[PDB]
Symmetry: C2
Subunit: 99 residues, 2 copies
């Protein structure tokens, strides 16, 4: 339906835990080609891809300078979340404790 956003993102609101064991982050799309899909990759402690942990139904950047809400269920341990493409990609770290 849509293609992935080629542009830059910035943090509108810092990543935060929710009441039900998920995380939310708000991001601002500074680039062009909107409406486009927000690129999101989640990797685990070994930098292996982790699938199906994106709770929000596929995140879009609707316009230029639009703000997008992103809900995730990151996995156990240290996870690495990358948003966007290219050099300017946002790189976020999260830690979740388990058994």
């Amino acid at each position: 339906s849509y293609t992935m956003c080629s542009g830059k993102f910035s943090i509108d609101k810092e990543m935060a835990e929710t009441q039900h064991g998920t995380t939310v982050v708000k991001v601002k799309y500074e680039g062009a080609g909107a409406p486009c899909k927000v690129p999101i990759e989640i990797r685990d402690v070994n930098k292996e891809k982790v699938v199906g942990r994106i709770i929000s139904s596929t995140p879009l950047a609707e316009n230029t300078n639009s703000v997008t809400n992103i809900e995730l269920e990151p996995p156990f341990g240290d996870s690495y979340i990358v948003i966007g493409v290219g050099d300017k990609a946002l790189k976020l770290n999260w830690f979740r404790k388990g058994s």
Copy 2:
């Protein structure tokens, strides 16, 4: 343990049209016209139902090594109509493949 690259933001073009191989796969060759290389080639494969299709990328994770570099991409697309998208943005290459 390995290199950590990001996805290529730039434009791609077809260096060589998608073609069937002798061993039940396809190959396509693509040229990276953009910047930030070496970066990862964005590749998505969807089926007739527009549903993601997993583990059909045979090539070990495809990279664009340099600017104007040519990357060989081997895939095992599913039966029927598949939709392959390469790169990001408006200029993303959109390929429709039909397999019998």
